């Protein structure tokens, strides 16, 4: 466990970091707060996750940050260049960050304006939720349009972008993207499955419920 410890439970924001450790074979210890909170609190008094701790007492939080950090810890140059793009390949690095952003922002935003409300986890509002969905459809189209002539989002390899964007899409495929949806958004589906299958996410998508019943309003 020389390379550090990654305090992470099983929340979507933890999936990639966890997968990264496995797939990149990082010498990083993965633990859940419950598995050792006497240490989690001492290292992260804010008891927030994902939380990473490397030697010399380095601390770091926020998924994105940890994801990037972990990737760089890897010694597999080909992998690093594949996930974040080559140093001499700026065009790619940027593009990866582009989608890395559309997903992490543009699409992930609406979850708290749709999934949360519908799943009855916050005050429901037809006018609102229905307006949030429109946002979702706007982003969803950005994706589909690209996935239609391209295998992956920012390159011709699964990149850190695809990984993250895949994790975000998850909750949507469980509460909002049903049969009729998947029928009109093939590319997204195609792409989604290929990304889940990877060693990066495979173990996180064990029992995955592909909803076919777009959660309807309260009651």
* Strands of the 59-61 sheet, one edge to the other: 29-31, 5-7, 51-53, 59-61
Topology annotation, domain 80-219 = Glutathione S-transferase Yfyf (Class Pi); Chain A, domain 2 (1.20.1050)
The two domains 2-78 and 80-219 share their CATH topology (first three levels equal): no
Which residues are within 8 A (CB) of 131 and not within 5 positions of it... i.e. 6 or more apart? none
What backbone phi and psi angles, to 5 degrees, belong to 25?
55, 35
Three-class SS of the chain: CCCCEEECCCCHHHHHHHHHHHHHCCCCEEECHHHCHHHHHHHCCCCCCCEEECHHHCEEECHHHHHHHHHHHCCCHHHHHHHCCCCCCHHHHHHHHHHHHHHHHHHCHHHHHCHHHHCCCCCCCHHHHHHHHHHHHHHHHHHHHHHCCCCCCCCCCCCHHHHHHHHHHHHHHHHCCCHHHHHHCHHHHHHHHHHHHCCCCHHHCCCCCCCCCCCCCCC
The full set of domain ranges for the chain reads: 2-78, 80-219
State the pairing for strand pair 59-61/29-31. Answer: unpaired
Topology annotation, domain 2-78 = Glutaredoxin (3.40.30)
The residue behind tokens 């996930």 is 83
177: exposed, middle or buried (C-beta count within 10 Å: 0-12, 13-18, 19+)? buried
Encoded tokens for 72? 């760089």
Cα dihedral 8, 95, 172, 107 in deg (nearest 10) = 100
Q: Which of 86, 102, 211 is nearest to 153 (CA)?
A: 102
Resolution in A: 3.0
Q: In whole angstroms, how large is the CA radius of gyration of the chain?
A: 18
Sign for the pseudo-dihedral over CA of 16, 22, 28, 31: positive
């Amino acid at each position: 466990m020389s390379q550090g410890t990654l305090y992470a439970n099983f929340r979507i924001r933890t999936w990639v970091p966890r997968g990264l450790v496995k797939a990149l074979k990082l010498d990083v210890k993965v633990v859940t707060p419950d598995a050792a909170a006497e240490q989690f609190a001492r290292d992260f008094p804010l008891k927030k996750v994902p939380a990473f701790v490397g030697p010399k007492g380095y601390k770091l939080t926020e998924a994105m940050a940890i994801n990037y950090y972990l990737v760089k810890l890897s010694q597999d140059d080909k992998m690093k260049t594949q996930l974040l793009g080559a140093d001499d390949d700026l065009n790619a690095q940027a593009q990866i960050i582009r989608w890395q952003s559309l997903a992490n922002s543009d699409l992930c935003i609406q979850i708290a304006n749709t999934i949360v409300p519908l799943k009855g986890g916050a005050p429901y509002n037809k006018k609102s939720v229905d307006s949030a969905m429109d946002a979702v459809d706007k982003i969803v189209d950005i994706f589909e349009n690209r996935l239609k002539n391209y295998t992956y989002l920012a390159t011709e390899n699964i990149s850190l972008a695809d990984l993250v964007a895949a994790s975000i899409f998850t909750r949507y495929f469980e509460s909002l993207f049903g049969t009729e949806w998947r029928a009109q958004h093939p590319a997204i589906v195609r792409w989604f499955n290929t990304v889940r299958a990877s060693p990066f996410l495979k173990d996180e998508y064990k029992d995955f419920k592909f909803a076919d019943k777009p959660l309807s309003p309260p009651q």
